[PDB]
Design a protein around this ligand. Structure first.
Ligand SMILES: N[C@@H](CC(=O)O)C(=O)O
Ligand SMILES: N[C@@H](CC(=O)O)C(=O)O
Ligand SMILES: [Ca+2]
Ligand SMILES: [Ca+2]
Ligand SMILES: [Ca+2]
Ligand SMILES: [Ca+2]
Ligand code: NA
Ligand code: NA
Ligand code: NA
Ligand code: NA
Ligand SMILES: [Zn+2]
Length: 316
């Protein structure tokens, strides 16, 4: 909408106060004009019609319980935009400052969030398995990274290419979580998963087997569930990325860690310059090796660590 840029204040899903960029025109809208061609947050009003209504508020204060998922979807989209711009010199998900659109209060009791090809969509959860999913910065960044992938490598969402697509979203979701530097970790969705249980999440990158996911190619799932295991076999790549960053010895193979910033540079370059819609895990290894070679040289520690990490998870 056309209107002047304003600064509202509210509370997110976890009760934390934060400022949000809004737009004033009769109402205050969740429209952030400070980033690209805008960040826009919508109310789906417990229905499944999308996007729903651009979020309108009478007084620019967002402290109602019903407001909290919208506050966080809007704010964490901004953090994710900042990460890609400041760390990777990428302007929004398409590299040309596309407007970022999110809808909250999707459906009733909806225990998921997703990117639908055009926008981010967040359920409220059922209160037991999930609370509103935009409360997790890693979840928000995971979803927006699917948009980046769809404008770059275009990894098909099935079998090994789909597992790479998922791992890329977990990797950059986690790197955004570290960038914001509140309570960062290598697990996925802990802030919004199972409010009655401490310490758990949907997936672990440091130990995928904690939640039943493979941590070695010999344990890959080859059935048809979950688009051929895209959220299952992502563990093999998540573990490799964890090892590249943090190091460790896994199934007897030692990896020298090179840290999060270099992990991000290597995988961002692989995503944008080497991967294609049909890339498999072995092609991902090759893309990461060549990306690290471009950045650091063929004889570098960084290239050696990429090779060790893919060796450790059985990807040749
Ligand atoms: N981010 C979504 C991807 C999808 O729409 O399948 C999810 O991982 O649940
Ligand atoms: N954290 C993401 C990943 C997934 O869907 O599996 C989400 O809840 O969508
Ligand atoms: Ca209000
Ligand atoms: Ca965390
Ligand atoms: Ca996390
Ligand atoms: Ca929990
Ligand atoms: Na999705
Ligand atoms: Na995608
Ligand atoms: Na699991
Ligand atoms: Na390929
Ligand atoms: Zn995903």
């Amino acid at each position: 909408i056309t209107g002047t840029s304003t600064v509202g204040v509210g509370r997110g899903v976890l009760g934390d106060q934060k400022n949000i960029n809004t737009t004033y025109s009769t109402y205050y809208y969740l429209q952030d004009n400070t980033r690209g061609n805008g960040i826009f947050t919508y109310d789906a009003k417990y229905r499944t019609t999308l996007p729903g209504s651009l979020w309108a508020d009478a007084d620019n204060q967002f402290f109602a319980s019903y407001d909290a998922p919208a506050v966080d979807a809007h704010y964490y989209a901004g953090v994710t935009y900042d990460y890609y711009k400041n760390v990777h010199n990428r302007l929004s998900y398409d590299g040309n400052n596309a407007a970022i659109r999110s809808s909250v209060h999707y459906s009733q009791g909806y225990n998921n969030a997703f990117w639908n090809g055009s926008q981010m969509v967040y359920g409220d959860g059922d209160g037991q398995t999930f609370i509103p999913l935009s409360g997790g910065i890693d979840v928000v960044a995971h979803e927006l990274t699917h948009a980046v992938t769809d404008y770059t490598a275009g990894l098909i969402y099935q079998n090994e290419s789909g597992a790479i697509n998922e791992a890329i979203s977990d990797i950059f979701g986690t790197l955004v979580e570290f960038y914001a530097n509140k309570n960062p970790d290598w697990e996925i969705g802990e802030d919004v998963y199972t409010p009655g249980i401490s310490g758990d999440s949907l997936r672990s990158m440091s130990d995928p087997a904690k939640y039943g996911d493979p941590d070695h190619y010999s344990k890959r799932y080859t059935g048809t569930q979950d688009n051929g295991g895209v959220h299952i076999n992502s563990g093999i790549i998540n573990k490799a990325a964890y090892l590249i960053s943090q190091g460790g010895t896994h199934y007897g193979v030692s990896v020298v860690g090179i840290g999060r910033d270099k992990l991000g540079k290597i995988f961002y370059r692989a995503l944008t310059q080497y991967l294609t819609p049909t890339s498999n895990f072995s092609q991902l290894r090759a893309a990461a090796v060549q990306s690290a070679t471009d950045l650091y040289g063929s004889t570098s520690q960084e290239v050696a660590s990429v090779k060790q990490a893919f060796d450790a998870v059985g990807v040749k």
